[PDB]
Amino acid sequence: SVLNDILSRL
Amino acid sequence: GSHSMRYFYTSVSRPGRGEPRFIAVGYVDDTQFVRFDSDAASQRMEPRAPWIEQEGPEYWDQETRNVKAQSQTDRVDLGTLRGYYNQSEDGSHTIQIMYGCDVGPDGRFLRGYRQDAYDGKDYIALNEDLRSWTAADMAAQITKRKWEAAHAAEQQRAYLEGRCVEWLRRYLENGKETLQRTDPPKTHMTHHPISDHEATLRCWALGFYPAEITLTWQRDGEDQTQDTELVETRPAGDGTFQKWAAVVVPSGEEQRYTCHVQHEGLPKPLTLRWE
């Protein structure tokens, strides 16, 4: 499965 | 008998500040099994393997919603990084992500990966301890400070040690016929004269999986590395890979050079010869 915790850069 | 699952995200900004092209692929042990293209009219996660098509709709729905969330996140950072570095409005830029996990013969966690890149240069990466970040200069330091104070590496570790390893074990079981297979290479040697004093011996190796193969030349019993040429391991289009190595030899001394092939699917390293 793909990553679930999406992190926003900058 | 270790294995690894890897995902590759790619967000390419448009010269007209349009909708960036988002292409996502997933590989379990050098075997692609999923895809997602923002340009394709389906806009859903598509399967690329036989063993992965058996998954239910709740699987594809969750993978599509999460792959779309990262695509929308990368789009915002694309415009932000464009204004941070004062890059041209008529230019195209790229954000790339690579994450995955490694399992051993017992199926337990070994190594985790999470690294980002902007325009082919490294941005921020998650270290092996999965608790610290290694960031580049400028914008990557801002992301590092943002993610450190937010404890972002904690939730990244939970996926690489939990969901990633869990689904990797499931993929290796439903696709054991292809993921845990070892296709040995079919090797042969050719002869290509250059002039009346030199010649080229090309040592082939076709139809092997995995792509890990070592082609080495030897003149007599010593390792011959001078005047040799190796090409990058190229795919064939059927799940197997190809690779060959050449050597410029004087005419008449072709039988002095021996090609040695080492592959995971071979019982013993091979040794090719003759012109």
Binding site: - | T10, V12, D37, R48, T94, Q96, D119, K121, E232, G237
Partner: protein, 98 residues
């Protein structure tokens, strides 16, 4: 921030004239991803040219595989035309059965 593409044109199976095979053009080691690959049959771009899904290596360099099924002969000369932002003019790499 920009890398020139590597081109390898080859066949999926050993080339036997009169028998069906697959012509592969492997463009790797390039950046950015905007690449234009056209397989050429005697200088004519083939229609049903398919390509794999976009991916990259650990060095962030992309790699693509444009492929189409073809039947090799003796007189036909197959090649692969690739144009990139790093290349001033498209790079022609003819297919050699060897």
């Amino acid at each position: 921030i920009q890398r020139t593409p590597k081109i390898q044109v080859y066949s999926r199976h050993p080339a036997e004239n009169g028998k069906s095979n697959f012509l592969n053009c492997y463009v790797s080691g390039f950046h950015p991803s905007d690449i234009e690959v056209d397989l050429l049959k005697n200088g004519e771009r083939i229609e049903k040219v398919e390509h794999s899904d976009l991916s990259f290596s650990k060095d962030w360099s992309f790699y693509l595989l444009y492929y189409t099924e073809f039947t090799p002969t003796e007189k036909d000369e197959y090649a692969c035309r690739v144009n990139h932002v790093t290349l001033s003019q498209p790079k022609i790499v003819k297919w050699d059965r060897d």
